[PDB]
């Protein structure tokens, strides 16, 4: 990247290492986990890193396991503004044939249902865990080879591990390492047009077939050409200089100009597109501070505060009731309050003396002495000191 | 409801009452469907599916491609691979086809595997070579630009190619040998139309429009044995930016500086990424006039080709080049970006006529006027065969390019063209050779059979002479 | 015919290309006309609060004009003088009324003294444009094709669909204002109901009835005779729009303002003619006849002599020279 | 330098009869302002004007090549099913014929 490194160094490309020897890098070629991304209006990233936009309104197949059937992910799109080019994702449905053939539905308010019944989180069933996140998001985790993220306002992610390489099919692709065969339709043949590709993965015939994928919705609202061009020039500015080298900007620049010109409130489409790029940079390692009073500093509640890089390990009052569980998490962004204060049921971060216990599903209060004829317990400081 | 299908009702037996909601038709039969219940409608039998309001009785229903219907048994041609639908899915061959670099305009490159990227440079760069890793290797093609960091009426390209100890190079619309190579048999030049086609072996070829476009063509023979600015020709598109130091870069401008030939010339600079390159920057009108002129790529005469080849890459080049390029008298930094797309269209069988008298005219009357009488044989063509027979090259050749644009001669059959004389002529007046009877080229200046001294019966032919020299005995 | 006419008259009222009336107390900018498949231009109308402020014309994405009612004009943010001719658009003043002609693009827009907007649009847009002035087929029952592509019956969720925001505007939805007329009424309504009725009775208006019906015109006036006060001039906006309609349909009608007791406003010296020619010989004009053979136009012009010189009327004897 | 073609070898005969400095001032003014993309016409028409004046003073001029303002004429022969080949571009030919 136009930088000198001495001999014997060892860089990392976030999955593989590269050691300098005799002016040549010796690089490992192990397989890496995939990331298919849905975001913005109708902007998609394949597992093999192909970027495309498909503004179809139907119920589409996004990702399926296609040699066995360990899962299938289905995405439901709707028109999301007055403009016809604005087509967002409202919901995403998930099917686990291993567990009762259950059907999970991630809803538009970051809610979740399992076979119709809404659920209070967390949901530690055997294989799958569903819990909230630091950002009022939701994270599905089936085993250790499948993660997901929120489809509240339409930013689904999926992490697939290398054991699913070349054995998946959908709009997200084959996950085989090649970008070129990602417009591969269910008839075992690749199509050159994005309009024909997406219309082959729709599940319903009553739906329409998209004839036309546009690129410039600023033509129908010519009042926003100046704001759209000036507001996301920050992305090619030196504010993001540390990860122009890690991940290319020009697609994320192309998605912003489509979203701000097309959506109802470009307050949030602007500041959801810039956060799409920052999350990509952070996934490589580059953390960035792009928040401002002008550029969408979020207002954390009374006790909480913006925090660029934290830890979801010791915050919630549930963590004290569950210490021997582990926090194999990363350094996340969001809204915390200082370390002596821990979250509560009602989102009020209080000291650990007013921290309830979340024992056996139930919840007890900071000095509830419960007992039976074969045990005795007491919730002291978030942990329930049980005995026999 | 109608006889051809049977009514359905929700059973309270099971929640899985998939009915009118999960209406299986052709394109969603293999796919998976949600259902919260039935709609208690009237759905086709278990042995068939809906199609275009017709409940097509069999599971032989069509096999779509490009939004078009194909009954079973119908075939399509994609590349050099025919493909057919057997049951409900297409069944394609596995013959790997021939790949093609390109220099679309001044500063853009299209890899073998297919990857457009922006690299403006002014040094000399390796475009493709076989000297890569653990290969013994045979050739080394280079490309040298000058004054071409900013596309304009500047930026003349120079190309040197090093093969079989040869050095044939080219600039200023001409080809110039500097060191003839050993196996002259494979060397072959074809000056047809707007192009210099240039053959160098069983699996190597070059195509040059005399100004800017460099299209080296390779075959299955190599298949992950090359590297350079064009990549490695392995099918994988994500690894075409593996630099000389054996790692991938995320930025193309750092990839190309790895392939410069002189380590002590200038590294081209990281430009800050803008959609408005140079002169389209502050002038939003000239950014709109350039687009609408470049929206010809999505025009009525190209609609047939827009289905096979995406115009969005070639549209990005049309905006980049003629924004920076200040065109005064030679509208060439625009007309060459569109001739490139039309050339690709023609290779996929779609001949195109986009060229009129008020848009990129390309006259051809000069090759008839130099004669005292205007004989009128040269005519411009949409796309004519590049591989034909002449007084010089009477035999049929390996034809890497089906057809090409440019000023093509034409006179009735029984008359063969020469290039020394702009006009055509009968065959017998060609300086053609046939020594001892057999059919070969027009007396190629080649030593035939150095292999066997005893069977060394050498026979050359300058123009017509029925001659045979003697083989100098080694003893 | 060969042309069309939309009109945004009175307070909040609209008249489409095909004869559909409806009120709209908008609060921000809205699309009036323009192609619904490909936009080479877009006529836009900006409101402040119910009441209108400006008419705007954007040409693709490169050029913009904003004529106001106060008289100011601006290309982008920079205020410019008038007349003005850039980019195939002639921003002029005809018959006291400001005009924005785009005959290359196929439209003519003019605002009058009272602030009422008007858009004339070619037949090259029949069933090829949609917006707050609807489409330009002949049928009036289908003028509410929303931006989503669907029909409608409420004029507001239709017209709110065509709102066009900006980085500075960021506009919200509009609702029907409260009606303070059901309570405020009495002897006023009985006497003030008359002015809406004469559209039928009086002979001068009594011959456009085969051309256009006054039924939607009397309907829209009666709901505005109730909030105003101290005069009978509250009905004449509906009355003026009826005249301007019947003229466009090919029946000009004369002398209707002699007894109507509502003179349309115009500057000092000039009074409201009806059917004046646009190429009024002024003080520094060339005597070049049989060239301005354009259609006759309504508006105000100087007295019989009293030529024009820089926005006033002056007798021909006092014609200046220029150097 | 592109407009210095007005003072070039093929125009030397006409530069003695007609001053090129006026037509050079126009060649610079027009194609500075004019952004030419696909139709190099705001340059080729300023030079065709000077050549027209030169021809009226008896100085016929051939300044037009294939890489500078080509002006093809093959379309009026192709519309016929057989390419009869009668139309040809002429430096300066009589406008008044029969
Ligand atoms: C496809 O064609 C091949 C040709 O050998 C045949 O063996 C195979 O059974 C056919 N079916 C598919 C779809 O593979
Ligand atoms: C161009 O070449 C093709 C194939 O030889 C021929 O059919 C066509 O008539 C030619 N047209 C022109 C313009 O010469
Ligand atoms: C043909 O070759 C002979 C050598 O035996 C030579 O003498 C003769 O000049 C050649 N003819 C021509 C036309 O070059
Ligand atoms: C009213 O006219 C004035 C005169 O300068 C101008 O400043 C103003 O902006 C106009 N009104 C509005 C709402 O713009
Ligand atoms: C108007 O255009 C629409 C959209 O193509 C078409 O469906 C309709 O028939 C047209 N109406 C008329 C009156 O031509
Ligand atoms: C047309 O050009 C030719 C060649 O310059 C010339 O001989 C001829 O006189 C010109 N036109 C005529 C018919 O005068
Ligand atoms: Ca793939
Ligand atoms: Ca490759
Ligand atoms: Ca209508």
UniProtKB/Swiss-Prot annotation, chain B:
All residue ranges annotated as the TIL domain in the record: 10-61, 380-430
Protein name as catalogued: von Willebrand factor
Gene: VWF
Resulting phenotype, residue 383 to R: Reduced secretion and increased intracellular retention. Similar phenotype
Glycosylation sites: 91, 381, 465
CX: region residues: 60-87
Domain VWFD positions: 99-266
Disulphide bridges, residue numbers: 1-42, 10-38, 44-55, 101-230, 123-265, 132-227, 148-155, 294-318, 305-345, 323-325, 360-364, 383-403, 387-399, 430-433, 468-471
Region (Amino-terminal) residue spans: 1-21
Region of interest (E1), residue spans: 22-67
């Amino acid at each position: 990247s136009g930088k000198r490194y001495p001999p014997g160094t060892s860089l990392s490309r976030d999955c593989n290492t590269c050691i300098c020897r005799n002016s040549q890098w010796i690089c490992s070629n192990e397989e890496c986990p995939g990331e298919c991304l849905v975001t913005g209006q109708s902007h998609f990233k394949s597992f093999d890193n192909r970027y495309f936009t498909f503004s179809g309104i139907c119920q589409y197949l996004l990702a399926r396991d296609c040699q066995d059937h360990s899962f299938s992910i289905v995405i439901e799109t709707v028109q999301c503004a007055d403009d016809r080019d604005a087509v967002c994702t409202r919901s995403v449905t998930v099917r686990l044939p291993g567990l009762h053939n259950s059907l999970v539905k991630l809803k538009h308010g970051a809610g979740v249902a399992m076979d119709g019944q809404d659920v209070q989180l967390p949901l530690l069933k055997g294989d799958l865990r569903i819990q909230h996140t630091v950002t009022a998001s939701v994270r599905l985790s089936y085993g250790e080879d499948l993660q997901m993220d929120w489809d509240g306002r339409g930013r689904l992610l999926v992490k697939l591990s290398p054991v699913y390489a070349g054995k998946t099919c959908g709009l997200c692709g084959n996950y085989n390492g090649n970008q070129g065969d990602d417009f591969l339709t269910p008839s075992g043949l690749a199509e050159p047009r994005v309009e024909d590709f997406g219309n082959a993965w729709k599940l319903h015939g009553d739906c329409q077939d998209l004839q036309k994928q546009h690129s410039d919705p600023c033509a129908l609202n010519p009042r926003m050409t100046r704001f759209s061009e000036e507001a996301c020039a920050v992305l090619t500015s030196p504010t993001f200089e540390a990860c122009h080298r890690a991940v290319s900007p020009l697609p994320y620049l192309r998605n912003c100009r489509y979203d701000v010109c097309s959506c109802s409130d470009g307050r949030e489409c602007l500041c959801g597109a810039l956060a799409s790029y920052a999350a990509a940079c952070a996934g490589r390692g580059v953390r960035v501070a792009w928040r401002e009073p002008g550029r969408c500093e979020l207002n954390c509640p009374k006790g909480q505060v913006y925090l660029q890089c934290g830890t979801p390990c010791n915050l919630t009052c549930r963590s004290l009731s569950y210490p021997d569980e582990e926090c194999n998490e990363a350094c996340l962004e969001g809204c915390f309050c200082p370390p002596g204060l821990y979250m509560d049921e009602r989102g009020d971060c209080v000291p650990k003396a007013q921290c309830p216990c979340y024992y056996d599903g139930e919840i007890f209060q900071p000095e509830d002495i419960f007992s039976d004829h074969h045990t005795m317990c007491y919730c002291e400081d978030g942990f329930m000191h049980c005995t026999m | 409801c109608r006889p051809p299908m049977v009514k359905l009702v929700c059973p309270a037996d099971n929640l899985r009452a998939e009915g009118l909601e999960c209406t299986k038709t052709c394109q969603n039969y293999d796919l998976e469907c949600m259902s919260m219940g039935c709609v208690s409608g009237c759905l086709c039998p278990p042995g068939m599916v809906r199609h275009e309001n017709r409940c097509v009785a069999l599971e032989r229903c069509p096999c779509f491609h490009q939004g078009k219907e194909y009954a079973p048994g119908e075939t399509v041609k994609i590349g050099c691979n025919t493909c057919v639908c057997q049951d409900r899915k297409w069944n394609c061959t596995d013959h790997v086809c021939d790949a093609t670099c390109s220099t679309i305009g001044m500063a853009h490159y299209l890899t073998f595997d297919g990857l457009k990227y922006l690299f403006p440079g002014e040094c000399q760069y390796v475009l493709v070579q076989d000297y890569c890793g653990s290969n013994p290797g045979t050739f080394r093609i280079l490309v040298g630009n000058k004054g071409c960091s900013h596309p304009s009426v500047k930026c003349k390209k120079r190309v040197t190619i090093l093969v079989e100890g040869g050095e044939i190079e080219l600039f200023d619309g001409e080809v110039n040998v500097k060191r003839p190579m050993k196996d002259e048999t494979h060397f072959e030049v074809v000056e047809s139309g707007r192009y210099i086609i240039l053959l160098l072996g069983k699996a190597l070829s070059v195509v040059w429009d005399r100004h800017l476009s460099i299209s080296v063509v390779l075959k299955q023979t190599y298949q992950e044995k090359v590297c350079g600015l064009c990549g490695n020709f392995d099918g994988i598109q994500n690894n075409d930016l593996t630099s000389s130091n054996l790692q991938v870069e995320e930025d193309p401008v750092d990839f190309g500086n790895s392939w410069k030939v002189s380590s002590q010339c200038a590294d081209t600079r990281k430009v800050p990424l803008d959609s408005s390159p140079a002169t389209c920057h502050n002038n939003i009108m000239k950014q709109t006039m350039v687009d609408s002129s470049c929206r010809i790529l999505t025009s009525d005469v190209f609609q047939d080709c827009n289905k096979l080849v995406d115009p969005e890459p070639y549209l990005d080049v049309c905006i980049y080049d003629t924004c920076s390029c200040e065109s005064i008298g030679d509208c060439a930094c625009f007309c060459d970006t569109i001739a490139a797309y039309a050339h690709v269209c023609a290779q996929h069988g779609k001949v195109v006529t986009w060229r009129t008298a008020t848009l990129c005219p390309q006259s051809c009357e000069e090759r008839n006027l130099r004669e005292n009488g205007y004989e009128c044989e040269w005519r411009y063509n949409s796309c004519a065969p590049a591989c034909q027979v002449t007084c010089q090259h009477p035999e049929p050749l390996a034809c890497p390019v089906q057809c090409v644009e440019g000023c093509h001669a034409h006179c009735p059959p029984g008359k063969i063209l020469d290039e020394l004389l702009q006009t055509c002529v009968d065959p017998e007046d060609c300086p053609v050779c046939e020594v001892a009877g057999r059919r070969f080229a027009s007396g190629k200046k080649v030593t035939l059979n150095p292999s066997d001294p005893e069977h060394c019966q050498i026979c050359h032919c300058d123009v017509v002479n029925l001659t045979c020299e003697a083989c100098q005995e080694p003893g | 015919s060969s042309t069309a006419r939309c009109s945004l008259f009175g307070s909040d009222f609209v008249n489409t290309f095909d004869g559909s009336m409806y009120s709209f107390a908008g609060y921000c900018s809205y699309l009036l006309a323009g192609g619904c498949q490909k936009r080479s231009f877009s006529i836009i109308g900006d409101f402040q609060n119910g009441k209108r402020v400006s008419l705007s014309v954007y040409l693709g994405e490169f050029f913009d004009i904003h004529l106001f009612v106060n008289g100011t004009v601006t290309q982008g943010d920079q205020r410019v003088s008038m007349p003005y001719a850039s980019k195939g658009l002639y921003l002029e003043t005809e018959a006291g009324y400001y005009k924005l002609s785009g005959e290359a693009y196929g439209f003519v827009a003019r605002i009058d003294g009272s602030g009422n907007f008007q858009v004339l649009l070619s037949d090259r847009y029949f069933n090829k444009t949609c917006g707050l002035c609807g489409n330009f087929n002949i049928f009036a029952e289908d003028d509410f094709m929303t931006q989503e592509g669907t029909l409608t019956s409420d004029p507001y969720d239709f017209a709110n669909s065509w709102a066009l925001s900006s980085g500075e505007q960021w506009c919200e939805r509009a609702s029907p204002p409260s009606s303070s007329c059901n309570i405020s009424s009495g002897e006023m309504q009985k006497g003030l109901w008359e002015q809406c009725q004469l559209l039928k009775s009086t002979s001068v208006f009594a011959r456009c009835h085969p051309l256009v019906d006054p039924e939607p015109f009397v309907a829209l006036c009666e709901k505005t005779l109730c909030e105003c006060a101290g005069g009978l001039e509250c009905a004449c906006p509906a009355l003026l729009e009826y005249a301007r309609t019947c003229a466009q349909e090919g029946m000009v009608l004369y002398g209707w303002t002699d007894h109507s007791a509502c003179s349309p406003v115009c500057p000092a010296g000039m009074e409201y003619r009806q059917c004046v020619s646009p190429c009024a010989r002024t003080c520094q004009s060339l005597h070049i006849n049989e060239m301005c053979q354009e259609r006759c136009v309504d508006g105000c012009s100087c007295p019989e002599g009293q030529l024009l010189d820089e926005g006033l009327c002056v007798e021909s004897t006092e014609c200046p020279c220029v150097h």
